[PDB]
Amino acid sequence: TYCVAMRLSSGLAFASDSRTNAGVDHISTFRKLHLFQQPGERTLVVQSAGNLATTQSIVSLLQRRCLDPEQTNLMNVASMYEAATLLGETVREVINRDSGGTDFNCNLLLGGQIKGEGLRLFHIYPQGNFIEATQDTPYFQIGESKYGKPIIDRVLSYDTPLDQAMQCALISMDSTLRSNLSVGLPLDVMIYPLDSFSTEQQYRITEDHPYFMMIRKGWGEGLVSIFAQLPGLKLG
Amino acid sequence: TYCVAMRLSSGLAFASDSRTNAGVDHISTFRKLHLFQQPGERTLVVQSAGNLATTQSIVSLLQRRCLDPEQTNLMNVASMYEAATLLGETVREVINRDSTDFNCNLLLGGQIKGEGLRLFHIYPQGNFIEATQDTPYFQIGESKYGKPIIDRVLSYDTPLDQAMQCALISMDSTLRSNLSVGLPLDVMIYPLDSFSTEQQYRITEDHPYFMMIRKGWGEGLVSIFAQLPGLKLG
Amino acid sequence: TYCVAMRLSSGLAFASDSRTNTFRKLHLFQQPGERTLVVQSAGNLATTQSIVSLLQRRCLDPEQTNLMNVASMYEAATLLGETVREVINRDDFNCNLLLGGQIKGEGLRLFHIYPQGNFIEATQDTPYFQIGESKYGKPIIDRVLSYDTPLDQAMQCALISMDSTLRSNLSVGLPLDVMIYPLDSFSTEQQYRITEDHPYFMMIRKGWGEGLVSIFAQLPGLKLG
Amino acid sequence: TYCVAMRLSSGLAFASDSRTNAGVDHISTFRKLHLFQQPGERTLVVQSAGNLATTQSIVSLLQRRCLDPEQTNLMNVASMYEAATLLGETVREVINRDSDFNCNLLLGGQIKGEGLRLFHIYPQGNFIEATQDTPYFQIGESKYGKPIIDRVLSYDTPLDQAMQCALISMDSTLRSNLSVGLPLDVMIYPLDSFSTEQQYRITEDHPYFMMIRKGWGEGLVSIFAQLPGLKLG
Amino acid sequence: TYCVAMRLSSGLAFASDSRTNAGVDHISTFRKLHLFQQPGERTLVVQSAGNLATTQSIVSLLQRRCLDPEQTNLMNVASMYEAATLLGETVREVINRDSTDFNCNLLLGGQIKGEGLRLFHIYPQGNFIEATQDTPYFQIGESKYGKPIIDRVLSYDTPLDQAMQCALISMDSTLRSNLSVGLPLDVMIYPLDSFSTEQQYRITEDHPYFMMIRKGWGEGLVSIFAQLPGLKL
Amino acid sequence: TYCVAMRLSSGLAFASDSRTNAGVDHISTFRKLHLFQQPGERTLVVQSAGNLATTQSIVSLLQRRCLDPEQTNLMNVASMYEAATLLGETVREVINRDSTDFNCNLLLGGQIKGEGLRLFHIYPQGNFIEATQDTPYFQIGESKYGKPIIDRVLSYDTPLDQAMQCALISMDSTLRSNLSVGLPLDVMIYPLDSFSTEQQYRITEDHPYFMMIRKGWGEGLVSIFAQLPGLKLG
Amino acid sequence: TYCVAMRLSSGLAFASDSRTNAGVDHISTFRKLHLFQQPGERTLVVQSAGNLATTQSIVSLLQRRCLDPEQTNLMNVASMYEAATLLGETVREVINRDSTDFNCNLLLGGQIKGEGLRLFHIYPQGNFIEATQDTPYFQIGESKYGKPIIDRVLSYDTPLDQAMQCALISMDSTLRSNLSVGLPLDVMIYPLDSFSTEQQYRITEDHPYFMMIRKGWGEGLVSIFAQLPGLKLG
Amino acid sequence: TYCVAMRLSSGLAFASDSRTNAGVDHISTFRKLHLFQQPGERTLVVQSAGNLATTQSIVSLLQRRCLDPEQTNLMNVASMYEAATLLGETVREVINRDSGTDFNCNLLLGGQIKGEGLRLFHIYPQGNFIEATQDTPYFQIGESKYGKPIIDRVLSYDTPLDQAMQCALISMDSTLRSNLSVGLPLDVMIYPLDSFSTEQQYRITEDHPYFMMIRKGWGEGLVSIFAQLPGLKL
Ligand SMILES: [Cl-]
Ligand SMILES: [Cl-]
Ligand SMILES: [Cl-]
Ligand SMILES: [Cl-]
């Protein structure tokens, strides 16, 4: 479980793995990127980490309540801030129901755009409160995140173009996949261009995916080449 | 707090930062690489992570007891394995006296004449594991930031100087990404059969070569990134 | 005790053994033309039988939430959790449940209920759940089952899985209770009890066993150098 | 962690994975098959599962005590049965010292003057011995790989096929539980040979292993497809 | 996290750092100086300390409610005092919803046309105090390191540029002594009656003047120390 | 309440204020610097902060036991480390008997013949940390006001007299910024290998040199500020 | 925080300190004597003690509302009793809004034309009492230290100049005895039927007369003690 | 209830009132100065404040246990420090029994045991305690603030015994005049250094000539000093 989200001037980039810990001996594939879409009006992405029972319930309840117009839901919230308030309430609702402790805890990332607004990205905590990405901290990570953090800090900034933000996300994934076996393919990624309200750039990245293979091989080879040509060690 | 140690065919490489959390409003610099040296006979290195009160006491006890020939100490143990057994005992002794608040992790590496290079990781519980050709390095403290470069370029047959280059790059990525890790560094190269502590160095913010390799690595990465083939998710 | 449930595009397949250490490990909550719910049990027998009995007894009370008047399978899963927690609070006794079936107005849904009373739902990415002594029978499921596998081949997969389990672990034993639930059918017709004398089960086991021995002998010779 | 050892009429076959759980967020590669060899006189194989620190200490102690003739060790114990008792004592010694800390071990090989013997040593230090009717032992994550062994292995199965059976068992296990992983360490011990030459490291790039996995998988899918149609009525 | 505000006769001076603790392994840069601006009419500065989720919700709710003319907001309150009461209400609202773990402190300083400069310190309870000529500045966050130079050099009558200087030296000493406080900085000079936000600046580690003033202060101090009379106890 | 101790290459420097909060409406003057000295053999300094009942009891018990040769005391401990352990043990003894209300912090520094200068910070839990060359000083009590000047000029190699000057300045800024700290002061300079407590001093409101250095420092700060480069942010 | 008010035959005398604790570790200077003056028609003095946020809100609300003739305010109330009532109402208003730790005490004194001098003590609950000839003064804050001198020398008929002397001696003893009370002071003499704030003063540490009255009282007192008859309790 | 004790170079001075609140409508006279005496060997004085029932049970238990040589008691403790420890144990003892802050008390314990100097303690309701030093040479319990200013301006560690008792009486007089919870008769005592005697112990009644004398002299003395002060120059 590793999800990352980036809020840039030109749009948002999302990447999630799918390797999930369901039990003592139950390691399986679950989608960790879900969409709430009203074409021409809103595009919302929810990413999951932590207890699978908890996050599946949060997504299911949200999806179900989207069908009830007499209730506050992700289709009739006026802004991304209200979506975050709503996500947080649902987090408390599900955790308190399942509880009798940190066992049922989750973290969520919520990102997107509602027509009438700019891009917004939030990190929701188990307590139900949340923080918002700014230009100074333009990305969020949830799950096993430290292996993939150094490359984002090296190359991502608020003004990084979308395609490069996504290359950065994939490289971040590559380093994580290589270093921690709790994170695993397939991947689910998405690029959201500003004011597009489009879900066309949604992709599942498997091991057989030709481009992910190439960027991994190219990056790896580039690094090994940089390393070999480093000037000789002079510690004295 | 981040320490790494590497056991290679030609020797050992050690790198430790010095930034320490002693109390919350008390974050300062403490050395996390200590030496037990017998010129021509043994070279043993201890790296510290976790509770500062606990690690300092363990090291002091080991240091005070090296001066007493009538008890087991790091100067009279016969193998690195007995050295590990002794460290393990002392951990349990210090933690049991002071009382996960008082927990520590240690790295123990070097050579005692008559045997090859050995490197151990000691746990709070006092048990330990040993580095092999398949898993030839250990990290303690805030280690994940710095792990990918090691997995990408380090193996048992990496020459000492490149292993040290790898450690420094590992530190660089850690320094950039987590503020609980901080300069100065204390690093050391132990060439096989040398029983020397001569290549022990303190790396400060002004160190010319550390500055150069960080800059060289960073610029190298930025260029590799820029030259990558265009995104094709379609 | 070993139970398996599969959620495919075209329907659901369930298989449970019955040896305990005979008790039913597959229960039906049936309303013809409206809903078909299957509950499977593994783990502490006292706990599981208590949970199942409360649920059945409450089906007789329409003024209470029960498996006959829940609006969706999601609510069915929520109810099961409440009952799990209710029994826990009242009284190690680990239990696991599988909940699968269909309520009209909704598609096929499948849940794994945990001892803590929380639960997960099967997806296209993870289209089956196992409870009980499950490791012996997992490799064949991974080899041949995917979300779009036909019901009959899914049931064949489940049976071979039982076979490997029956052969390897003596706490799992005949008879079997199995069921094929076709999409939108709301039927319990393809529910069957499989005993030692069942002709087709005998057939697939010998058929499967012989094939594997045949592939094995036909393998290219060992070359480890 | 998954280790299997097979005792046959013609020899022994051993297969171990190497994926190891050393600590929280520390899954690494460690060899789980170690050898105690006396050319022309003795060949002993020890396979490890469970707590890495415990098993490593046991192996290290055994290796170190082999250098001392004034002490009971795996070089001077008279039979495999005495070797098993020796392992068991060492298990208890290390566990009591380090005290969760539990391990399971497999012990197999031949001491000159005796036939092949194979033992499974438990964390309490006791042990059981392989027979002709139950001609293999497994430790670690073993259930996934058990059915294929029961279907095709017997006391009289030749060594090459026994090793093939181990490899398929490893394959179903690798595919089904991510705690088990490549590289592998395997070994074939021919009866009366006292040789350690047929020991191998199998990495992901190993051609025959790539081949046998591909061959077995395709075969299984063919048998499944050629099965008679479902008849539950 | 360290923010300071100074209310002087010729204007207001503000300085904020950006190092923030969002989670254990999440120390990041967040801006801690926010503006509510109506050209020619009002300029309001809000500084943040304490829980980030909490302070961001407070600022965001206020920003959103400014777009609603039918509701009390920072654009239609008549005095800086009503602004402060409004802040306190938003503080209690956020704390109640999200739940000292969620506690925050705020500084509110600025000017509404028809009134002089006003500066408030808002507490986690939603009540507040106001700066006077006797107590002309407030600090929030990690404040003790930087207090001695302010008490030493600042008074109600200090010219604006010297007040900003005091702030920068205050900041330097804090940076030098406590690692929870960190660059970049956000600073602002508000001259009396200007209703202007032009003099707002981001100070990075590369900022030429900040390097200069730190250097001058540091060498000046080291020279003062050396020229001290020899110790006579 | 503010205490600071510095361990330098040439000796140790100590300074403590005296303003103590003993009760709800009872803030009075109490000594926070106590000496255990055996001429020509040992000089040990203890500084106290936290609950007055607790620290006064710890000091009296240590003094009581110094008169009994049949039990471990500060007069017969072999190293400063065993002394720290003894302090930590006495802290736990008093806290448990009297019982965060009873908590205290202590500083312990000095020299025992046969070893170098050693300085410890003892925590209420009874464990402790040791000063090193990288962190050559400790503060207890109200310490943040007085830390920056120390970080600016103090180093392991600062000559003794300057270390004391730095301490007095630190004390001055604290006195000025927080009313829980107050004159008189009790200070001491311990030169390495001297084993003398001859340089212990009480600094009152009337102390001439302290008056001179305060006004001298204050005037100096104002002059430097004024000669700073003019503000240019545009 | 210490405030006193005296209602005498010839007028009123007021004195307050300024030391305020606004939060933990935030002890600073705040005015605790505020004026509401209508030249030739009213002179009202409000003195503050307790929670600063509470008292500052009370005074600010009162000041703002004086600018609103459409509302009851301290400028259009007919008598000091109506003023006390309004003050009590505002006390409840701020305390109920902000919500025992938001509590404050206030003194309200002066004269509104058409009635004589009046002085009130307003409590946190919003009710109040009024000074009479038998109890001609009120104190708020840290008051016990400065009470004996008032009881010994103050009466309803004490002249204004002597009354202020008593208040100053009351402060001196308090300043010397409790560190929550501190300079500068704000004092005022209000002569009967004057309606003037001409006699409003800030007393600093450098204030010539205050230094004189303090030294003079202190010196004289020590002299009295020396002239007492020898102790003979037997 | 007001008790004060002074520890000086030449001896100790004690003074206590007797007015006690035993119930809301039960305000009575009870002695608040008790003696534990061994002629030629020790003199201990215990002074009482707070809950009478608690205070009476403590003093009685100490008196009763003074009759049992097989138990730790105030007659066989080696030092005053051991006596304070004993009182604290008894304070906690009585409070835990009676509770199954209403039952809280404060105590003063002062005197001399042969072989030791003068010692004075203030015992807290928690059973912990502090000791008087040269820096704080007296303690007060009960309603103490009215009487604190005269002691601060007149008492020092080197103050002779007679002037110290005089200082205590004036302190009592001011308290009497300012607070109705404190009342005559008084119980006072002067203990000269190394005397181990209870002869200078006195009951001071309303009719006591010398106290009547010292009150009138001081009252007149103050009023005259007030009268000759320079006129207001604000
Ligand atoms: Cl609902
Ligand atoms: Cl020892
Ligand atoms: Cl890397
Ligand atoms: Cl009257």
Author numbering:
A (entry chain C): 1 to 100, 107 to 242
B (entry chain D), F (entry chain F), G (entry chain G): 1 to 99, 108 to 242
C (entry chain A): 1 to 21, 29 to 98, 109 to 242
D (entry chain B): 1 to 99, 109 to 242
E (entry chain E): 1 to 99, 108 to 241
H (entry chain H): 1 to 100, 108 to 241
Article passage:
Anbu shares distant sequence similarity with 20S proteasomes and even more distant similarity with HslV. The threonine, lysine and aspartate residues that form the catalytic triad in HslV and 20S proteasomes are conserved in Anbu. Based on the scattered phylogenetic distribution of Anbu with occurrences in cyanobacteria and proteobacteria, it has been suggested that Anbu may represent an ancestral form of the 20S proteasome or HslV. Anbu predominantly occurs in an operon of four genes in conserved order.
